[PDB]
């Protein structure tokens, strides 16, 4: 049982290692994708609605969506879909970085 | 490499006397602390025992240039001296043993000295580049170089040399200075070339005088037993009774190896 459990661990640390690392790369990828902005067409779909919520509940960014009336949330009334830009765009988040070590 | 059994005794005894001169107290002196980590004297031992086979692997011509030049310079080390003429001319291992014994009991080397200031130091780079020139008679390196033989031995060798300059910084004033005058004598005598301005250079710098050796440039090292084991199963070479200098150069006159 001891020798054969130790025989078991090998063939699994290969695939288990690859699966974990793939989850980490995907994590960074999704977070940067949500940070870059969500287009109108994506925000209409369910996935864009719950990804906008994902960003809100997790304090990653604020993503402008649609006002309760329906007209797009603008800061300045000239151009649609603006957001407030200051001092939080410039603070780096730990979820963007692949490398936690440096 | 193998030396006749008459030789190993003579060279070993000579070694023991120059060790007695170099250290009379028996409290082991500064000059042979050998190593500062504990892996260090072992690795030094193995490198030195392997070097001898690397000296036996040289071409025959270079071996005989070594051999006769050690004979000549050994007589120059005798000071006239007809009896040690006879004993030195008859046995070639013992000649190089006597050269390195005298030069190392008199504390001759730049390994024992410290240059201070740029003038003395460059002078050493010049003298070294003369001997490094004299070893390598082409761009091809000699087979006598051998800093390591595997990986990572060479870095240890770097650590010995770097650890040995500091001991040169450590010696007492009395010792530093007996080194000065003694190195003067080693240069002015072992060369035996009465120029004015050369002896002015040796007058100015004993560290120029420190790096004085055979024309080839590498002092033949002395080893207790070249390629002879400690294991029971030693086959020793059965040496013939006549032996002139070419015969330990060329290793003719060995015959079989006999003993369990």
């Amino acid at each position: 049982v001891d020798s054969s459990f130790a025989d078991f661990r090998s063939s699994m640390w290969e695939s288990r290692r690859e699966s974990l690392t793939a989850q980490d790369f995907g994590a960074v990828a999704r977070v940067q994708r949500i940070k870059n902005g969500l287009d109108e067409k994506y925000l209409m779909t369910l996935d864009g609605m719950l990804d906008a919520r994902y960003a809100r509940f997790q304090k990653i960014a604020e993503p402008a969506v649609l006002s309760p009336t329906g007209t797009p949330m603008t800061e300045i009334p000239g151009t649609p879909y603006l957001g407030s830009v200051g001092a939080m765009d410039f603070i780096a988040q730990e979820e963007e970085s692949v490398a936690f070590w440096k | 490499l193998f030396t006749p059994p008459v030789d190993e005794f003579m060279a070993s005894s000579v070694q023991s006397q120059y060790i007695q001169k170099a250290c009379p107290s028996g409290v082991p002196p500064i000059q042979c602390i050998e190593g500062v980590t504990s892996d260090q004297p072992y690795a030094a031992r193995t490198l030195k025992r392997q070097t001898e086979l690397r000296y036996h692997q040289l071409p025959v011509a270079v071996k005989l240039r070594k051999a006769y030049e050690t004979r000549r310079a050994a007589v120059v080390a005798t000071h006239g001296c007809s009896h040690e003429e006879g004993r030195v001319l008859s046995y070639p291992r013992m000649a190089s043993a006597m050269l390195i014994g005298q030069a190392e009991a008199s504390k001759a080397c730049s390994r024992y000295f410290v240059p201070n200031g740029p003038a003395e130091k460059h002078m050493l780079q010049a003298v070294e580049n003369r001997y490094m020139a004299a070893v390598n008679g082409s761009g091809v390196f000699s087979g006598a170089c051998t800093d390591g033989q595997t990986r990572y031995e060479a870095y240890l060798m770097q650590l010995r040399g770097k650890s040995a300059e500091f001991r040169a910084k450590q010696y007492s004033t009395f010792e530093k200075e007996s080194m000065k005058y003694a190195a003067r004598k080693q240069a002015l005598i072992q060369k035996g070339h009465d120029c004015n301005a050369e002896e002015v250079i040796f007058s100015n710098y004993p560290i120029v005088a420190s790096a004085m050796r055979p024309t080839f440039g590498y002092y033949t090292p002395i080893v207790k037993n070249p390629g002879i084991g400690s294991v029971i199963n030693i086959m020793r070479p059965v040496w013939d009774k006549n032996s002139s200098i070419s015969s330990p150069a060329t290793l003719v006159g060995v015959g079989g190896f006999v003993q369990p």
Partner: protein, 164 residues
């Protein structure tokens, strides 16, 4: 710091002689192989972070007892020291690919590492697990050109033989 230049210049300096035609052929070989080496250096400086990330993740994927209790990485800090060390070794492979010899990788990374690794109880086999993962990981052409792939394998194998 060994390269072709320091080898032939140090050799001809040792002869005390002007550099003959053979040294010139050697450096002309350096400027032939330089294209593949600098390609691999550009690409390594491209994606070094993901290389170090997968390297360290595979390193703890193999040996788990390091992250268990004891005499090893038992903090996020020490695992950050781990990924910093793998950052150093990839930085040295980058430098040795720029120079083209094993020079800076030897005299900066390899020399005297053994007393440090036996002193701070760092097992070298974990590093070896990381590097073997990276060498197995890179495809012949997807990651980089084949000539450069070969060069990268050579350097990384040298690290493993220095460390095993």
């Amino acid at each position: 710091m060994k390269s072709v230049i320091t080898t032939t210049i140090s050799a001809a300096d040792a002869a005390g002689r002007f550099p003959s035609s053979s040294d010139l052929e050697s450096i002309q070989g350096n400027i032939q192989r330089a294209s593949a080496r600098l390609e691999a250096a550009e690409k390594l400086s491209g994606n070094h972070e993901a290389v170090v990330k997968e390297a360290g993740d595979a390193c703890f994927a193999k040996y788990s007892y390091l992250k268990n209790s004891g005499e090893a990485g038992d903090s996020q800090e020490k695992i950050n020291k781990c990924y910093r060390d793998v950052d150093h070794y990839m930085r040295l492979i980058n430098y040795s690919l720029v120079v083209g010899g094993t020079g800076p990788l030897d005299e900066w990374g390899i020399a005297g590492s053994r007393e440090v690794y036996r002193t701070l109880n760092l097992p070298g086999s974990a590093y070896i697990a990381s590097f073997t993962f990276t060498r197995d990981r890179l495809c012949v052409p997807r990651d980089m050109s084949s000539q450069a792939g070969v060069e990268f394998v050579a350097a990384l194998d040298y690290v493993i033989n220095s460390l095993s």
